[PDB]
């Protein structure tokens, strides 16, 4: 991954 | 002053945002939102200047088969779009406070930097501080991130005047980030001392109770209240009702939350009371105890109301910390039993854990977003 | 919990409608919508699930001589139009909202009763409530309406199992409708404390204007906004001209709105504009002062875009604009070319345009949520 969140 | 408060992500993280965006008009100061279209609406019942950006979190407010912001294959595309129309929010301001999304974030903290302004960031727990993570797990963290959006960053860093950067990481997350969360519910480890943790941001809640609620809550015994978010999840569901019954159980009343989507409820022996968008502010300050699950935002309102609690951990944090601070009791399991959530209650309502629950809240602040201010309105004097 | 949102009328007796349903399906809820055909491509274009039922209301959508579905002679088709599309879309909702046309909000009501759901009547403005009518034509509207439709709603109401009913213009608004209207423009009188009135139910437009829109104001000075909506009256044209003038007299460009009445520019000018269909929320970002209609929907737009505005007479919001002090009531249906220069010039006064925009904020636009909310509490108590 590399481009956090939350969704 | 003018601030600009960008952010990219779900409501948990959203919402302290637009909280202290809300605080920092009150006192005078033009702020300016930048956030995902799908928060229009919420600005606007609030009412703060915001500039739409990007994808929408909400899978629903967004196209067919629309990617969400955070799709890998669209990183570029975000890089991107937020360099693009972040100028023109960011016109007038003097400061910039960002949280969520990495890539907006560095793609935000650039245009701070061109403009020479100061720029801070936020996370919601002690557990995201960068200085709670392992020195290896910061190299994957800046690796993987470089790695992702590395490349497209510096091309408009470069299209732009700025000078190539390394370690997205570190340049989106600020060698200490701020912590907006309560000092009481989320302290500080021994590692994270050179930290500024502002307290929680959460926006005051006006709204009055329901006529209907009113007179239920008059007409008898102080209820218990139960709820566990919005998670249409099957178990959710089942804990509801394993809790409904450790409360009837304990002869006592339930004022219970229930979603928009959820199917209406075949009947209500006169004891329950269903609740939707209500205020919880107001409310757990008319209840016994509350029984919900690991949240933050609940366990807080909950602890400045100084009621007693019931937390159901995730497959632990929060949970933990109300047993730690001995004012309520982490029940486990997707499901606890009627006998597991049947003696927490036993717990709950006792006198004494009542005065340690009134004890808490009189130790836990409701100045976050005040004293956040006060922190940007110094730092525009001294870096402007 | 799904809710059925119903009625027959204007545009502005359908947009509210529309919002709400929008916002329930936004905050998780799920809403159908049963609205006359004319419809159906606005909600194809909120996202809002629709089906279509009875005559078109817009004149020019149906063929030519065919009565309206407000016309008494169809009466009895209505009613029986109702009763026959609306089990389909009615089926497993929770409760149901309604406005409009009363022979269609009693065959729903009575559909909605038959499944044991709570139904809400809507109205757009105070003015509108059964408690700022004498109870006297209060039993006008009983007598006129049991006799209109009477028996054929009860025929139907037979049909599934319900004893009949009367006094059907209590029965179609209940004993207590809403008013969705906002406060500060539509406020309750003290003759109906008790109603409930939840603020305006205004749908968040999106939608961009298009690129010859754009270019006309760009390529000059802030035009004046002149529409009537869904006027379709003869006056209506002959009141479109008059302003076109008063506007232009005074030397300002215009944006006309085609309408109902498909009003057409009275030359090729370049310093005016028609449109269709357009983001009015928009739009009145960015106009001078609008001169429009009397009607709850376009009046409370422009006094949340914080312009001044221009009120055509029948002969209710026409006097609250004035009295609001945000704008000017002139005479019609057709306003003399003195009036509107007089009006276009006291509204674009320095005075006007000041309290235009404070009033504007003075708008709550929590109007779909409050709806929302007691929704969610009916369904629960009942
Ligand atoms: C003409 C037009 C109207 N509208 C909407 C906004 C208004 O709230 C709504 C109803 O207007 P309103 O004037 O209340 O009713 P009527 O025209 O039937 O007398 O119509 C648009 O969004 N776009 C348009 O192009
Ligand atoms: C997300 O990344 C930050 C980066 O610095 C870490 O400090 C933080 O611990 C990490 O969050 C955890 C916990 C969480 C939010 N529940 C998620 O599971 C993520 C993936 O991991």
């Known amino acids: 991954x590399x481009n956090x969140x939350y969704x | ?384």
């Open chain 2, 1 to 384: 002053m003018r601030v600009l408060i960008t952010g990219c992500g779900s409501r948990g993280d959203t919402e302290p945002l637009v909280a202290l965006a809300a605080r920092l008009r009150e006192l005078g100061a033009d702020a300016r939102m930048c956030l995902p279209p799908d928060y229009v609406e919420r600005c606007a019942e609030v009412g703060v200047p915001m500039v739409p950006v990007g994808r929408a979190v909400r899978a629903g407010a967004r196209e067919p088969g629309e990617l969400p912001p955070g799709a890998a294959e669209v990183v570029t595309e975000v890089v991107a779009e937020w360099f693009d129309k972040v100028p023109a929010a960011i016109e007038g301001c003097d400061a910039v406070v960002t949280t969520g999304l990495l890539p907006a974030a560095v793609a935000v903290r650039s245009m701070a930097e061109k403009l020479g302004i100061p720029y801070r960031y936020t996370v919601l727990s002690p557990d995201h501080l960068p200085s709670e993570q392992s020195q290896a797990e910061r190299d994957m963290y800046n690796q993987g991130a470089d790695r992702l959006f590395g490349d497209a960053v510096n091309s408009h860093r470069a299209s732009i005047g700025l000078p190539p950067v390394e370690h997205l990481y570190d340049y989106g997350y600020t060698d200490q980030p701020w912590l907006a969360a309560d000092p009481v519910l989320s302290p500080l480890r021994p590692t994270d001392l050179g930290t500024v943790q502002t307290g929680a941001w959460i926006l005051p809640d006006e709204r009055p109770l329901s006529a209907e609620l009113e007179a239920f809550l008059a007409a008898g015994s102080t209820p218990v209240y139960v709820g566990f978010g919005s998670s249409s999840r099957p178990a959710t569901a089942d804990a509801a009702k394993m809790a409904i019954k450790a409360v009837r159980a304990s002869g006592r009343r339930i004022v219970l939350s229930r979603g928009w989507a959820d199917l209406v409820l075949p009947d209500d022996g006169a004891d329950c009371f269903v609740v939707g968008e209500v205020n919880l502010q107001e409310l757990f300050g008319r209840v016994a105890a509350a029984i919900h699950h690991d949240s933050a935002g609940t366990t807080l309102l909950a602890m400045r109301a100084g009621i007693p609690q019931i937390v159901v951990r995730r497959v632990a944090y929060h949970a933990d910390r109300v047993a730690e601070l001995g004012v309520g009791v982490a029940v486990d399991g997707p499901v606890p039993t009627i006998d597991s959530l049947s003696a927490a209650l036993d717990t709950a309502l006792a006198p004494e854990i009542r005065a340690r629950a009134t004890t808490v809240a009189d130790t836990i602040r409701a100045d976050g977003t005040t004293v956040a201010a006060q922190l940007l309105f110094d730092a525009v004097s001294l870096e402007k």
